[PDB]
């Protein structure tokens, strides 16, 4: 039911898949054509990558970072990585204290290497579903 890449998986289903995935993390900002990373989409395609790895990407990429990173102070971005990644908000000032953290030493790409590798993202989403806002936890 949620946003899915079962296996053979037509192209069509791809393309509908990589439409979740930007509406996702990118905040529901539909972005120009120009903005779209078609290698990593063609990739996903393909088959070469799932869909948790092109979340991945997105998230790293300099679109997301533009968006959400630059002109927020961490605080802020941390919200939004909750978000965008976990498809909710954090619970505790503790959860948003470790990201800080996280980013002061390890730096933005580590961050997000975190909400992604997380328990709760495996468990939520996995390799093939599509983070979307979980009203209920
Ligand atoms: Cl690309």
């Given at each position: 039911?949620?946003?899915?890449?079962?296996?053979?998986?037509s192209?069509?289903?791809?393309?509908?898949?990589?439409?979740?995935?930007?509406?996702?993390v990118?905040?529901?900002?539909?972005?120009?054509?120009?903005e779209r990373?078609?290698?990593?989409?063609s990739?996903?395609t393909?088959?070469?990558?799932?869909?948790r790895e092109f979340?991945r990407?997105?998230?790293?990429s300099?679109?997301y970072?533009?968006?959400?990173l630059?002109?927020?102070?961490?605080?802020?971005?941390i919200e939004?990585?909750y978000k965008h990644?976990?498809?909710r908000?954090?619970?505790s000032?503790?959860?948003?204290?470790?990201?800080?953290?996280?980013?002061?030493?390890?730096?933005?790409?580590?961050d997000?290497?975190?909400?992604?590798?997380?328990?709760?993202y495996?468990?939520?989403f996995?390799?093939?579903?599509?983070p979307?806002?979980?009203f209920?936890?």
């Amino acid at each position: 039911r949620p946003v899915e890449l079962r296996p053979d998986f037509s192209l069509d289903d791809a393309k509908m898949v990589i439409r979740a995935v930007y509406r996702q993390v990118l905040g529901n900002d539909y972005i120009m054509d120009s903005e779209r990373l078609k290698g990593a989409e063609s990739l996903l395609t393909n088959g070469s990558i799932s869909v948790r790895e092109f979340v991945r990407t997105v998230a790293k990429s300099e679109l997301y970072k533009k968006k959400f990173l630059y002109n927020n102070f961490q605080t802020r971005v941390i919200e939004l990585n909750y978000k965008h990644l976990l498809g909710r908000a954090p619970f505790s000032e503790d959860e948003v204290i470790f990201h800080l953290d996280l980013y002061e030493n390890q730096g933005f790409d580590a961050d997000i290497d975190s909400y992604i590798d997380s328990v709760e993202y495996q468990e939520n989403f996995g390799e093939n579903i599509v983070p979307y806002y979980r009203f209920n936890n």
